[PDB]
Design a protein around this nucleic acid. Structure first.
Ligand SMILES: [Zn+2]
Ligand SMILES: [Zn+2]
Ligand SMILES: [Zn+2]
Ligand SMILES: [Zn+2]
Lengths: 74, 73
DNA sequence: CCAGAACAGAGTGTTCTG
DNA sequence: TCAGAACACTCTGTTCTG
């Protein structure tokens, strides 16, 4: 059974280039195209799992990017 | 004017014993009375300010309590 | 002035569709 | 196969009332 490379939850398939859960899929699209105040309250090392993924959108987006998510050819 | 001792925002008065903004007032009553599953994603030192106070309710609650907030006062 | 109620929003996560 | 739309919810924050 397949696991999200970002938050560890159960993954539906490959989204924006990366094996991810549905919530990480849509969070990534929204973060890149949106305007948000995202600032880590930590050390930019926050644990991102299902229970805590809402805690630090800044670390979550970082994980999306470092995993290689992208919206396609520029 | 005066600053919230929890998140640093603009303080609306003395709530539950501590100089506090309005958001932190109701966050605290909800946190102490209800049931949540707050879990720190960090090292339990998270920065609590207006920009980030939503990030870590657990660190926020610890900070409210360390400041001396209580539903009795 | 302050506590609690009432009211409203941000951000999130799911179901549905082709 | 995966991307997008759009509703429903959770926690949150502000205005209102006593
Ligand atoms: Zn995920
Ligand atoms: Zn973080
Ligand atoms: Zn505050
Ligand atoms: Zn924390």
């Amino acid at each position: 059974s397949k696991v999200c490379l970002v938050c560890g939850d159960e993954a539906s398939g490959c989204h924006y280039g990366v094996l991810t859960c549905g919530s990480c899929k849509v969070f990534f699209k929204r973060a890149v195209e949106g305007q948000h105040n995202y600032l880590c309250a930590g050390r930019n090392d926050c644990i991102i799992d299902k229970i805590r993924r809402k805690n630090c959108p800044a670390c979550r987006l970082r994980k999306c990017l470092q995993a290689g998510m992208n919206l396609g050819a520029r």
